Write a protein that binds this ligand. Structure first.
Ligand code: HEM
Ligand code: HEM
Ligand SMILES: N#Cc1cccc(CNCCc2ccnc(-n3ccnc3)n2)c1
Ligand SMILES: N#Cc1cccc(CNCCc2ccnc(-n3ccnc3)n2)c1
Ligand SMILES: C[C@H](O)[C@H](O)[C@H]1CNc2nc(N)[nH]c(=O)c2N1
Ligand SMILES: C[C@H](O)[C@H](O)[C@H]1CNc2nc(N)[nH]c(=O)c2N1
Ligand SMILES: [Zn+2]
Lengths: 407, 411
């Protein structure tokens, strides 16, 4: 039960002890591996709080202290009285940093302890939510010198007064269904772009329209707000070699900000906790641009490159894929917006694994998600065995609000 | 139980009932997934139910379940087991077994071809010389002057684990690797240890960059013997690029026949420790892994230089750019010489169809996403977007230890 992980390129072996702490289930069994599957009371609450405070207090070298036992009693009483409890600012920050640290699908976790935590638990309205988000966006963007941040809205109570950001990311481009069956803009957001328009939103109906924010506070109906454009940093995409690339008329946004996840800390649930870091190049160039159910531009680019598209054997797609990804990197770098290529990021994740195994006894990791969607085996993470397991505090998926909301 | 898998690019949802027939363990638990872990003398006590399970399958496949022929066969096997401690498969059962082991091989993307497998029965073999002969015939038949045919040669099964037949080579055809005293490496670094063994065993090495290794062959538990495959039986392809003329001057070539020879084949509880099989290459096996892995020939540098790429920063994606051209050259060279090969787009696409068909006809298709997804351009192949369930069915191909670590030397 003391598992080893091997890097097959370096023969480096690491021993994993951290997994023994894990409590939540993987979805796997002894008979079947589900590693490639995308989606996996008062009496419940106190042991959860206890486990968290124990590790919090251990992390600061006061395990078993008076202050430890005291915080424990104090929280125990508040749960017994209120049926919930409130985190101290220090515990909140710790919890958030550790949810990131525990995110087995995030390749950028080497940065985990440098997170800026915005406490938004005093928020009561969607306008208030918008204000906190504009502040997050402006701060995180930092004129292109990106800084990791999370903003944390009030925790769930009854489940009918949830704070929710309806957007999947704070900044995304619209998707419109044409009359000729086609799709203009981002196909992933066709449904959300629909709801925004359903709720008002004058759609410019372009290829790249910044979606409006759709914010839900205390379980009320959601409200539309438009992010000040001067806060949405965007990058025109050109190639350092192909002058015609400019004329594809592509661009992307600089701030990658996940807004639809649920943050769990010491048994408490934060249903609205948008966070942001900075892009790995492939997220945009490989997935956003070249995924078939997304912008799917491969053909158009290969046309422009005059490649033999008559046989898959020519690897025309691969050739275009590389150039596109070159362009993305080049463009962000030229405009001074933070970005990391898949080589640097995976190399840094390897060193991070080394660090975590050394100081924590392990690092949960999802190989299926960690390995970049291009050039897999020429990145070191490919040759790195990884153990996947769920530690708390965590970021979890949660249902889309429009399927759930008592509208 | 019933399990659903979803393709996130097509929304196609498939239902798996087949995983219920799985008996062997995966390595995972409710609390840990070991899906990325590379690697995660039998008594009459356990053997008959293993026999029966296999015989029940086989007779179901031929639509004779519960027949007198089925029942008599069970009876015959049971009697032979308790009298002799083991049993022999009929030719029909062996062929079925070998094909289904391939069919059940969750790490093989080439399984659309599973039913077209040429089975050579080498169970009458007694000596290494005999093994060489069988293996030569296999290579000649499988190669077929470039028009490759999938085949497997099956040597006698294990008895007491002291008389194992083994092919010591990891593949029937592979290049030698030589560690130089300066730390550098000549040839294929993956083969340094094995190359050293052959040399110790008496192989006179030419010490080049592409020396075809000798066969090191073990029959009946005896010490292994060296043989040289007749060079005219080894089809090789010089690698060139369709636009880049300096590419041929890299001096690269590869062999045409990919043949795994170190695995163990299990059928009805019987263990076949020598069972070399061969298909044909997916281009990335060579162009990406063989040529570009840092721990292999590792040509990215030399290629990128000759391409005059900006090699100063990784952000230029010079490595990615070179990798593509190399894989273009490998596919080009094989097609030009009419030697069977398949690109990663074509092969993954066929696998999806195979998979869909297996779910409908068989109730599932065990697959290892980690291995099925090609080592370049992953998400522009449809397998990246396919949820897959991994589980173990028998008959099966299993890993076994390297014979030099276990062999008892007669002297
Ligand atoms: C700062 C640099 C960062 C980099 C380079 C980075 C990189 C990535 C990448 C490439 C993915 C895969 C996303 C996908 O394929 O959909 C990912 C996922 C994820 N990241 Fe990060 N990230 C960063 C910051 C953060 C921060 C600040 C947090 C939280 C505080 C975070 C938490 C997560 C989580 C929970 C996932 C899984 C998302 C999902 O399952 O959909 N990351 N990250
Ligand atoms: C006909 C063309 C075939 C193609 C294109 C193909 C493709 C592949 C590829 C790309 C791999 C991954 C190898 C690696 O990355 O190390 C693989 C693995 C495997 N294949 Fe095939 N294959 C073919 C035929 C066969 C045949 C004839 C058999 C057996 C009768 C077979 C059984 C297996 C097994 C057992 C593995 C796992 C190997 C391991 O774990 O080391 N395949 N296949
Ligand atoms: N549910 C769901 C679900 C399934 C597959 C992918 C998805 C998107 N995952 C996040 C993608 C994304 C976008 C922008 N930014 C970031 N990001 C930023 C820092 N770390 C990740 N991540 C969600
Ligand atoms: N143990 C082990 C282990 C770890 C990584 C790669 C490995 C080789 N896997 C097979 C490679 C290979 C070579 C030639 N041919 C084929 N081949 C033929 C048909 N299907 C695959 N496969 C073994
Ligand atoms: C089916 C498969 O699990 C799915 O396509 C996964 C594969 N790996 C991934 N990896 C990352 N980083 N992001 C993803 O969306 C996915 N999708
Ligand atoms: C650690 C990791 O599982 C290992 O590098 C695997 C990844 N996927 C693979 N996939 C294939 N086809 N072949 C391999 O050798 C590997 N190696
Ligand atoms: Zn698993």
């Amino acid at each position: 039960r003391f598992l080893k992980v091997k890097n097959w390129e370096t023969d480096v072996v690491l021993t994993d002890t951290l997994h023994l702490k894990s409590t939540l289930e993987t979805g796997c069994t002894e008979h079947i591996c589900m590693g490639s599957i995308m989606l996996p009371t008062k009496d419940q609450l106190f042991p959860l709080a206890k486990e968290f405070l124990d590790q919090y207090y251990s992390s600061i070298k006061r395990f078993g202290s008076k202050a430890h036992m005291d915080r424990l009693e104090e929280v125990n009483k508040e749960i017994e009285s209120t049926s919930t409890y409130q985190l101290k600012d220090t515990e909140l920050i710790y919890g958030a940093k550790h949810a990131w640290r525990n995110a087995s699908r995030c390749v950028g976790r080497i940065q985990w302890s440098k997170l800026q935590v915005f406490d938004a638990r005093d928020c009561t309205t969607a306008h208030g939510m918008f204000n906190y988000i504009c502040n997050h966006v402006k701060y995180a963007t930092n004129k292109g010198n990106l800084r990791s941040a999370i903003t944390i809205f009030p925790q769930r109570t009854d489940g009918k007064h949830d704070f929710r950001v309806w957007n999947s990311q704070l900044i995304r481009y619209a998707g419109y269904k044409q009359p000729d069956g086609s799709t203009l803009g981002d196909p992933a957001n066709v449904q959300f772009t629909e709801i925004c328009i359903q709720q008002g939103w004058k759609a410019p109906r372009g290829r790249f329209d910044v979606l409006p924010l759709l914010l839900q506070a205390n379980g009320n109906d959601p409200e539309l707000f438009q992010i000040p454009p001067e806060l949405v940093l965007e990058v025109p995409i050109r190639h350092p070699k192909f002058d015609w690339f400019k004329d594809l008329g592509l661009k992307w946004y600089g701030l990658p900000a996940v807004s639809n996840m649920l943050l769990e800390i010491g048994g408490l649930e934060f249903s609205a906790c948008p966070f942001s870091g900075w892009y790995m190049g492939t997220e945009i160039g490989v997935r956003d641009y070249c995924d078939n159910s997304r912008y799917n531009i491969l053909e158009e680019v290969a046309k422009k490159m005059d490649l033999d598209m008559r046989k898959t054997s020519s690897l025309w797609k691969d050739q275009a894929l590389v150039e596109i990804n070159i362009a993305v990197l080049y463009s962000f770098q030229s405009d001074k917006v933070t970005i990391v290529d898949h080589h640097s990021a995976t190399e840094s994740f390897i060193k991070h694994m080394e660090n975590e195994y050394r100081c924590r006894g392990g690092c949960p990791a999802d190989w299926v998600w960690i390995v970049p969607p291009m050039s897999g085996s020429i990145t070191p993470v490919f040759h790195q065995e990884m153990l996947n397991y769920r530690l708390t505090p965590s970021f979890e998926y949660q249902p889309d609000p429009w399927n759930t909301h008592v509208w």
